[model samples]
Target: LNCGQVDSKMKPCLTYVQGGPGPSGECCNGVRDLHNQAQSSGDRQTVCNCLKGIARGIHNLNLNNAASIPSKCNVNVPYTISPDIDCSRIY
Candidate 1:
């Protein structure tokens, strides 16, 4: 789903969780902010790696513009999909 998919409760991904295209680089970059805030510090490697993971996953699915995965995934900034989503899910 595209950004602004939040519900009235502000919970994102409620209607869709496919993690496919439509998520912009800005979105995934936002997720990096969330990831960093988790530990009170942002990890460049972690963020980059997370973006890479999304790219790889999208690539495996034969989706183009894998580079945009991070932005697309980050659409939920200021809010998170869940506290549990980690790099493991990226790849």
Candidate 2:
């Protein structure tokens, strides 16, 4: 993922991860966009780090909700979305 576009791609996901009842269509669209963009293992790792970095800055980010997002959006990432993930081993 291009780090710049990564933010824009997943920006819509914020509401649901921040306590919204559910993800909006646009949010899932952004999720899918990210899934499609990260086709390589290295790219996926990059996406993971950037995403986790963003999560760190969010005061109310619900990690549990974040964990459910991939399935909710009908996508599967190579690794889990969490602060503990080892970006080096995603492949």
Candidate 3:
């Protein structure tokens, strides 16, 4: 159920990763929500897998922009936003 919120909140960030302007306030809110809500290793992995799916589906996603999201939104997710990341290592 919390992963639902993670998906909804993270959806907005996709535009930014697809080379739009910097993350909007709404996107930032989602990032903060995801960061705050996912309280366990499994939760974090779920979020990581969700994001990995997003990254994989996007055409020409900007890795730099994706990586910038956490710092830009002042959220600190454990894993970086790269297609090559190991989801199991997120926690």
Candidate 4:
């Protein structure tokens, strides 16, 4: 359940795991990278920040679905740089 690439106008892509009540841990990487690139290129900070918030929301759901994971399993995901992207038109 990968949403692939997301344009600004589009909501961030969500990936839900099979038989899971919510998102998989893998989805956390996607959200982190999405916002990281947005910020690195000096794109819309508001949108980037919004995406970070969204990631947190999804992360909470992941936790809710899988509480057995250790508290130390909690990680602050990193965003990566995207290449040759235009910053002005996030939406």
Candidate 5:
């Protein structure tokens, strides 16, 4: 799997999670696109890892807001979006 593509697709969400007040339409579309990309099941873990890798580097990321993006965007993700999550254990 290409983390680079995941990174590119998810970049729009960074600004929204760190105090953007509301989710950007571009960000949500990215979210949906990611969900679509992860439909193969195995892609989910790497996608999660790529996203967590991004979160780990961001000092101002609000985990609560980051966590809310799925619900707000109507994406039913199987795991929480956080730097701490273990993507390997995803079912």
Candidate 6:
């Protein structure tokens, strides 16, 4: 549940999730790093849980913007970015 604090590298993504116009290059880099880091199913699930918790905790989260992050960053996450997403299907 550390969110951005656990990895300062990912902090910029939080700003993008909060409806920022576009993710910074650093944020896109972070996204790439995160995508590459989840090399196993367990890792993917952990990341999914972390993101789900973060999204649920945010108020008035712009889900459309959230969903667009992967495509905008040119990263393809196994899971969809939606509050109602089924994490089980991520594998």
Model 1 CA lDDT for position 68: 34
Q: Quick one: ranking by TM-score, best first?
A: 5, 3, 2, 6, 4, 1
Measured with C-alpha atoms, the lDDT of residue 48 in candidate 3 is 77
Candidate 3 per-residue lDDT over residues 1-91, each given as its tens digit: 2455555666666767787775767765766666677667677787777777777877787877777776676776655554556678654
Give the residue spans of candidate 4 off by over 4 A: 1-4, 7-20, 40-91
Candidate 5, pairs of clashing residues: none
- Higher-TM-score candidate among 2 and 5? 5
| Candidate achieving higher TM-score, 5 or 6 | 5
Model 6 per-residue lDDT tens digits across residues 1-91: 2344324543345555666656667765666666687666666666666676666655566776666667676787755344455566565
**TM-score against native, each model:** 0.27, 0.75, 0.77, 0.29, 0.78, 0.71
**lDDT by residue for model 4 over 1-91, one digit each (tens)?**
1222443322323222113443444444544454455453345444434443444444333323222222223433222112211333443
TM match of model 6 to true structure: 0.71
- Separately for all candidates shown, the number of backbone clashes (residues 3 or more apart, or on different chains) is 11, 0, 0, 0, 0, 0
Write one digit per residue (lDDT tens) for candidate 1, span 1-91.
1223212211222222334434434445545544455442233235434433343333133222232333355443332343234434432
lDDT of 5 by residue, 1-91 (tens): 5888777766666655665655656666777877776776578788889888887766687887777777677787655556776578665
Lowest lDDT 10-residue stretch of candidate 6: 1-10
TM-score of 2: 0.75
Leading candidate by lDDT? 5
lDDT of 6: 0.60
Q: List where candidate 3 sits over 4 angstroms from the true fold.
A: 1-5
The parts of candidate 1 lying over 4 Å away from their true place are 1-16, 19-21, 40-91
lDDT of each: 0.35, 0.67, 0.68, 0.35, 0.71, 0.60
